[PDB]
């Protein structure tokens, strides 16, 4: 026991469907006795841009700015902007990181993309070498809880939008697995705007109910076959 | 001729490999007699976050904030923030939109993700019923010019990262095709940091040379089969 959870939450509106899914996760994980922290990115005005302001120390090469190189070195020297290290502390302490967001352009909203870009730097989240199964966040779990405009039917193989797993690839594999996370099955709450209020309440209750047994779940095999099939 | 091009450019450093690819595109398209415009997102300090500041008027619903609905209505009511409408004007005038960026987490840097989120609103880029082949930007061409850290071999179907086409799906299909663009084959400049000077020169020259005949190209079939098939 004694599990720690970080929820990285990306919605502007506390009364939103995303807000309800975040709150029910806080409620249920709290009820279980888990330690819970939420990064409410919009409320934090979280900075999404990868810039030279993210390093406060002497640059390795002040004539030609290479974000990856400079953040790697800043991580090692401890000269990263404090907003980044504040998030790194939350990740370091977490056993499970839940990302709660509406799908924007088959991906995460930009503010959350910026969290990934800025927080998961070399030295902290991965090394070269030291990625995928050797990533530095090994031993941790991650889970994408996503809401969509499109219906489940629209996000199937035979639909023009394609199977929902297709768009998970850059997030689950390219990012989370790359950093060493084991990835729990995504929670996709399809088309709440189209849904009836009863169907919406059902989707929120389904997430809460799933969370009751989250610590017993196995991760997915985060492979091309899982995402794309044969 | 009389062709118009917008380059949406996302790199912090003018002397970067991305910078050089952007500059060669400007040079070669300018030489051809094309009309060329560049949105240098980092130099513009482009806002990535989707917030209620993106609507200038009174909100469609001041009590509960729905970004998609509010921006749709704002577009119809000419009440979007000027940074967004400035970009929409550039897109509206363009026959070809080139995106020039380094791959960040199998996707675009957050600043460019924010451009997509905030600029391509419903009513402007898509609507009911105009999407995929009938998207509102139909008749326009789009092209992703991406640079990577990983090698071409890492980006193979059975390589650690999977086929590069796998990460293109959310961008080419879920975003560009969705908005009605015809998608020209991506330009992928693999691993310039690792490449020799000569190899880098070759990749820049390949891009310059490609641009010489860009108006003669057929778009790819932006399908699941192209992205995921044998
Ligand atoms: C920039 C942008 C890009 C997008 N790109 C995509 C894309 O690529 N693919 C795609 O499929 N969609 C896309 N969308 C649509 C988007 O994913 C949906 O709009 C979003 O997922 C809806 O979630 P929400 O929390 O905002 O819904 P909400 O509008 O907040 O929720 C709907 C309703 O649920 C109600 N509600 C809240 N809590 C509860 C509760 N506890 N019980 C019952 N009802 C409740 C709310 O009052 C509301 O009426 C995009 C949208 C934007 C703005
Ligand atoms: C947050 C983050 C996430 C990332 N995620 C990924 C990922 O998911 N997958 C992946 O594969 N990579 C990833 N990367 C790596 C990234 O994609 C590469 O670092 C980037 O593409 C390199 O391009 P660049 O323009 O910055 O190269 P640069 O470092 O600017 O350039 C490389 C070399 O080319 C030289 N050069 C510039 N112009 C010319 C010229 N005209 N002729 C010859 N040489 C020239 C430069 O001087 C330099 O020496 C990530 C990086 C970051 C920071
Ligand atoms: C017209 C607005 N309103 C009236 C019913 C319906 C809500 C709008 C719906 C949910 N939004 C969407 C539904 C489905 N797909 C989408 C893809 C993108 Cl990129 C953006 C928005 C999307
Ligand atoms: C000083 C040496 N310097 C090159 C300038 C280090 C370059 C490291 C290499 C290129 N970067 C990378 C190579 C391959 N994959 C990657 C995935 C991510 Cl997320 C981030 C960086 C990556
Ligand atoms: Zn994986
Ligand atoms: Zn397509």
UniProtKB/Swiss-Prot annotation, chains A, B:
Residues annotated as binding Zn(2+): 173, 177, 222
PTM sites of type Phosphoserine: 79, 196
Protein EC: 1.10.5.1
One of the GO biological process terms: quinone catabolic process
Organism superkingdom: Eukaryota
Subcellular location: Cytoplasm
Pfam families recorded: Flavodoxin_2 (PF02525)
One GO MF term: dihydronicotinamide riboside quinone reductase activity
Binding-site residues, FAD: 11, 17-20, 103-106, 147-150, 155, 193, 200
Family membership noted in the UniProt record: Belongs to the NAD(P)H dehydrogenase (quinone) family.
Reported function: The enzyme apparently serves as a quinone reductase in connection with conjugation reactions of hydroquinones involved in detoxification pathways as well as in biosynthetic processes such as the vitamin K-dependent gamma-carboxylation of glutamate residues in prothrombin synthesis.
Name of the molecule in the record: Ribosyldihydronicotinamide dehydrogenase [quinone]
Organism: Homo sapiens
């Amino acid at each position: 026991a004694g599990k720690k959870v970080l929820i990285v939450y990306a919605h502007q509106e506390p009364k939103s469907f995303n807000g309800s899914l975040k709150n029910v996760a806080v409620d249920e994980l709290s009820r279980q006795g888990c330690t819970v922290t939420v990064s409410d990115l919009y409320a934090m005005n979280f900075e999404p841009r990868a810039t030279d302001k993210d390093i406060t120390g002497t640059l390795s090469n002040p004539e030609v700015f290479n974000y990856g190189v400079e953040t790697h070195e800043a991580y090692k020297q401890r000269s990263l902007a404090s907003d980044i290290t504040d998030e790194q502390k939350k990740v370091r302490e977490a056993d499970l990181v839940i990302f709660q967001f509406p799908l924007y352009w088959f991906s995460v909203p930009a503010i959350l993309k910026g969290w990934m870009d800025r927080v998961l730097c070399q030295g902290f989240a991965f090394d070269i070498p030291g990625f995928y199964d050797s990533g530095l966040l090994q031993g941790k779990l991650a889970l994408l809880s996503v809401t969509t405009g499109g219906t489940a039917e629209m996000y199937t193989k035979t639909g023009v939008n394609g199977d929902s797993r297709y768009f998970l690839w850059p997030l689950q594999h390219g990012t989370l697995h790359f950093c060493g996370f084991k990835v729990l099955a995504p929670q996709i709450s399809f088309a709440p705007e189209i849904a009836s209020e009863e169907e919406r309440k059902g989707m929120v209750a389904a997430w809460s109910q799933r969370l009751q047994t989250i610590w017993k779940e196995e991760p997915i095999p985060c492979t091309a076959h899982w995402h794309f099939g044969q």
